[PDB]
Symmetry: C4
Subunit: 93 residues, 4 copies
């Protein structure tokens, strides 16, 4: 519960930072910058967007290292503290 | 055993949702939509398909967060509860 | 030790299957098929190669689900049973 | 603490090796080679860069297998031994 809200907040802040950075420096629309930040930090990495500037590439290196741990922490406390009970909730007689 | 069948079902439902969504909104053939959903949720993310609409991008953000935990849960109970014994089965004298 | 050799073998067999499949059905050179199989199962997924046939897409879906667990098992017993001691070996006085 | 500095060093060496290799054999600028090495070993894999030579493809196969375990080890001791306390530090009254 309180574990999940902190990681939720931390993740949001991380995604806000990426959104602001890539819309400014890489010139993406904010929605595209948010989408790209998520696709990056979850390691999906389609490559429909990718940084074209050296500033963007360097930030991306750091962003990935700092953000992956946080995002996946959230993903798997979300799966553990929120979806795992819910699935059990519609199971037991 | 029963752990594996639930995750199997949960994963199928998730993949069905993606298939329906991306074939409708992004106009993919259903097979391509299924393939894309799998490539997305396993984080492989080739990028041969990727959402072109804002609706698609927003759904994809949410789809990734909800679905990755489930898919990898399945992958590694499949590896743990199904392939791990089977490999041992063809080992011991 | 014996844990590591089994996973080594299992991984090789998986990579051989992908190499044969993608060189035949998707028409890749065998080296490209091997490279693509690795890039796929480690989830790197550059997308310089990706299946163009429905046969290829369906196989890829199954290949990913069966193979990711195995490949990462190997990766992290390799890191745990082989590189972890070696790094310690050049540490202690 | 000392766990984190070793993994920091090991990761740097790995990234230096990739930078040197891909700038030489694949002809990338060193910054692009570093960026590509990171994007590769974190499995993000945009595909804006990817090896075009057989030498590059073979190295990449080996680089991925050796380096992923190390990089993610670092990522999650960084998240565990460095960011986890820091976040708690700005929490408690
Ligand atoms: Ba492309
Ligand atoms: Ba990827
Ligand atoms: K990945
Ligand atoms: K890609
Ligand atoms: K990718």
């Amino acid at each position: 519960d309180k574990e999940f809200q902190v990681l939720f907040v931390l993740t949001i802040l991380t995604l806000i930072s990426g959104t602001i950075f890539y819309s400014t420096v890489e010139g993406l629309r904010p929605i595209d910058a948010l989408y790209f930040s998520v696709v990056t930090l979850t390691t999906v990495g389609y490559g429909d967007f990718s940084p074209q500037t050296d500033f963007g590439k360097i930030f991306t290196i750091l962003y990935i290292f700092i953000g992956i741990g946080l995002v996946f922490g959230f993903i798997h406390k979300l799966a553990v503290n929120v979806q795992l009970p819910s699935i059990l909730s519609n199971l037991v007689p």
